[PDB]
Design a binder for this molecule. Structure first.
Ligand code: HEM
Ligand code: HEM
Ligand SMILES: Cc1ccc(N)cc1
Ligand SMILES: Cc1ccc(N)cc1
Lengths: 443, 444
């Protein structure tokens, strides 16, 4: 009933523990020492980090706990506003935008996005086939090039043309720089850093607002938002909220999904039996020069490989909840109304009582049957009505792209890459490089 | 444009296709061959059977289509009359009864019915823990005993005492024989009519007296809400004749339709042990008191998911009927004239691979984690619109309460490795489904 807590630093309490370049991984080390739950204090803030399925399955009770904006999300809200991802459930724009946007992220809506996703994926395939001998691939960089172009085309019919560029796009320069300024505030004479954030917000907001003005009919999210009306209230999304969704989708769509692709490829080159087994599935299912939507649904082992990458290194590694009323967590940790919880997703996915002893081994076979996994044991996309609305978009693009990659190339970990996880607000394997040898199969 | 139609039998057209003991299941085999729509003609009748969400989402447009009394409901109407379920939308007693009765079927109204539901549920649990070793359970029979007793107590404070009987109640004996005669007329005798009239007189005689007997006790029951309720629209209360028709309507809906859901739910749980263990863990973690509370019953989310996925595969009221208010075009390719009839084959709707993926036949309750993700009009086990099931919250509450206690108190064993056999009356039931229950010996 007494809750553990890591080392303290006087009046700063636990905050210097976050003054590190890899905070989620440092939080994982504490959870290994302190167990399924521990209190984390800071000046003016208190939260509790959960790491066991036993406690997280109760925190996932939507009747008792609701999504809370973590300190990181409060700072991202300064440029994503009340978009879907940084709004409170009780805000009117959340439920409104949620009802308008759900049809355009469904599994049936992916049949329309499929043609645009293949468009970007073929550019990735042709880049790797046009590499010279002994040239290598910078994996997370190309994966971000792909995920960023896919959301721009399917989201607003815009071409970032990331495969024609060495330097990133002007818009994402301020977006990435705003995210860095957002994260740095958590672990913190800072007037220049603050003035720059304001300048960067003006750049994003002005650029996106013009895209809305230019459009004001194509089968993309921007059209669905300009013409859709919420069946509940009968009102459409206003223009200010629309750019908040566009900024939210552009941020979410580019690096958290590229992270999954990079982790997936890394685990496949470190476990050649699994890669071989997934390459065989790609060859027997992708029988056309261009994959179809129906073939992508048939790449089941590719789907399990992605799920097993999400288990070990979920690229959105945590989310925050608050207690709607006074309650008791697990019959031994009483909580007051408003108290905050943090679901440390990478520790949850290592609970030995759920996954057995081989928690660190990459075996996509764990996901053969979705019914054998206990409830709330696998939460890479968040939870409940506040779960990821882009989940089916992300898994379809990742399965399609990974399938073409395994079909067209043999892969080689020529540097014996030692996993180094860079942490922003998402997770990525930094410096992960491979060589791709063509299989000389036409497109 | 040209609509497919099945095999014909001369001048009888397609009617001998329904001369079978499993007509809905036979219609599903036809829908698999002919696709999303097909025409079904009989002597003096034509209807069209819809099976895809694409077409059913247009048939559920209340401004174009209204509820129609199918041939099955017309024969039920001979003893349920203009009750809520067998009246036309434009009949004055529907909108009148619908406004008086909706308050007594709301989610806030289940807080009053909960105490009586637990009363019957405890009797089911105690029957099963009092079984001897190697004794088995007859699932749909016991589920029927509970659902009939729950609606009798919550509807009119009457105890059918079904757990003290081997032979069914005298009232339901005549009702069940009336439903059998109603169904037999569809695939079709002077002797049947005499008993049918005798059977109809028995139902009117018990209920007319039960209404006459109630009149001044005030109880938290439908009968009280019907004797004192006034329609805010017209300002009138329901008269005696309509009241007995609702009671018969509720008694028929309460006993067989809801117990089918429980029996199908348990059959799917014993065939998918991973789901049952997952539902048993939730039941053990939520039902912490010897008697469940109303709020603990709202917390068994996965049990609710188990019921919903049971309703998807085998919706126990497997069809409803619509007619075109005016001339319109269905799906852009099928022209329809005002008055044309449609039939929604719910089991085929719930198997549309374009909505549920390929694994439509698999029992995965995880489809219902987020109810907003499923497209519009894709899941219609309780009908559609203002003519949708008024007892939906009442059925799910009882079924969630009862399934929760069963998963809490017993382990279940499919000792005969039961091959599913679906008996068809007007509703669906797994016939002969049996299980053994080993107690977990938790007190009540
Ligand atoms: C593999 C890639 C992805 C992962 C692991 C992921 C993960 C997550 C997680 C964990 C949350 C909940 C965070 C919280 O509870 O505060 C979330 C929410 C959200 N994600 Fe994703 N996401 C991915 C891709 C995407 C994509 C491609 C989009 C769309 C472009 C997207 C858009 C959103 C939105 C809008 C929300 C908030 C929805 C709401 O609150 O109603 N995500 N995601
Ligand atoms: C899981 C169990 C149940 C299922 C699957 C179910 C299904 C349905 C369906 C499909 C309809 C519409 C039929 C049509 O369009 O002709 C309906 C209507 C109706 N149900 Fe249920 N039902 C269930 C339980 C109950 C219960 C327990 C009651 C109350 C005792 C009830 C009372 C009614 C009534 C009165 C109507 C007609 C309402 C109107 O037209 O205004 N049902 N139900
Ligand atoms: C917190 C968060 C992380 C990733 C995504 N896509 C959405 C939200
Ligand atoms: C037609 C009909 C179907 C189900 C119920 N409960 C009542 C009537």
């Amino acid at each position: 009933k007494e809750m553990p807590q890591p080392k303290t630093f006087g009046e700063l309490k636990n905050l210097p523990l976050l003054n590190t370049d890899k905070p989620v991984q440092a939080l994982m080390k504490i959870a290994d020492e302190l167990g399924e739950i521990f209190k984390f204090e800071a000046p003016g803030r208190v939260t509790r980090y959960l790491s066991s399925q036993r406690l997280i399955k109760e925190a996932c009770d939507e009747s008792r706990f609701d999504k809370n904006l973590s300190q990181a999300l409060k700072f991202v809200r300064d440029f994503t506003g009340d978009g879907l991802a940084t709004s409170w459930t009780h805000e009117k724009n959340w439920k409104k935008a949620h009802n308008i946007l759900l049809p355009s992220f469904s599994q049936q809506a992916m049949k329309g996005y499929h043609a645009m996703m293949v468009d970007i994926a073929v550019q990735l395939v042709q880049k790797w086939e046009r590499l010279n001998a002994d040239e290598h691939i910078e994996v997370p960089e190309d994966m971000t090039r792909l995920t960023l172009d896919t959301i721009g085309l399917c989201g607003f019919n815009y071409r970032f043309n990331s495969f024609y560029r060495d330097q990133p796009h002007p818009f994402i320069t301020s977006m990435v720089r705003a995210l860095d300024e957002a994260m740095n505030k958590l672990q913190r004479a800072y007037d220049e850093n603050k003035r720059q954030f304001q300048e960067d917000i003006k750049v994003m907001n002005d650029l996106v607002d013009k895209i809305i003005a230019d459009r004001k009919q194509s089968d993309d999210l921007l059209t669905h938002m300009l013409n859709g009306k919420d069946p509940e209230t009968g009102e459409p999304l206003d223009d200010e909220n629309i750019r908040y969704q566009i900024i939210t989708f552009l941020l979410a769509g580019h690096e958290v999904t590229s992270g999954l692709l990079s982790f997936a490829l890394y685990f496949l080159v470190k476990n050649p039996h699994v890669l071989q087994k997934a390459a065989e599935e790609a060859a027997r299912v992708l029988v056309d020069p261009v994959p179809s939507y129906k073939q992508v649904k048939q790449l089941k082992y590719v789907g399990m490989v992605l799920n097993e990458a999400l288990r070990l290194w979920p690229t959105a590694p945590a989310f925050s909840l608050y207690a709607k009323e006074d309650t008791v967590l697990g019959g031994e940790y009483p909580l007051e109304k408003g108290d905050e919880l943090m679901v440390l997703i990478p520790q949850l996915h290592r609970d030995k009582t759920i996954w057995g002893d081989d928690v660190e081994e990459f075996r996509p076979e764990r996901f053969e049957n979705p019914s054998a996994i206990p409830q709330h044991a696998f939460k890479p996309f968040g939870n409940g009505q506040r779960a990821c609305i882009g989940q089916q978009f992300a898994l379809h693009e990742a399965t399609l792209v990974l399938g073409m990659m395994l079909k067209h190339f043999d892969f080689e970990d020529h540097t014996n890459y030692e996993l180094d996880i860079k942490e922003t607000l998402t997770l990525k394997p930094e410096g992960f490089v491979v060589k791709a040898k063509s299989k000389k199969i036409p497109l």
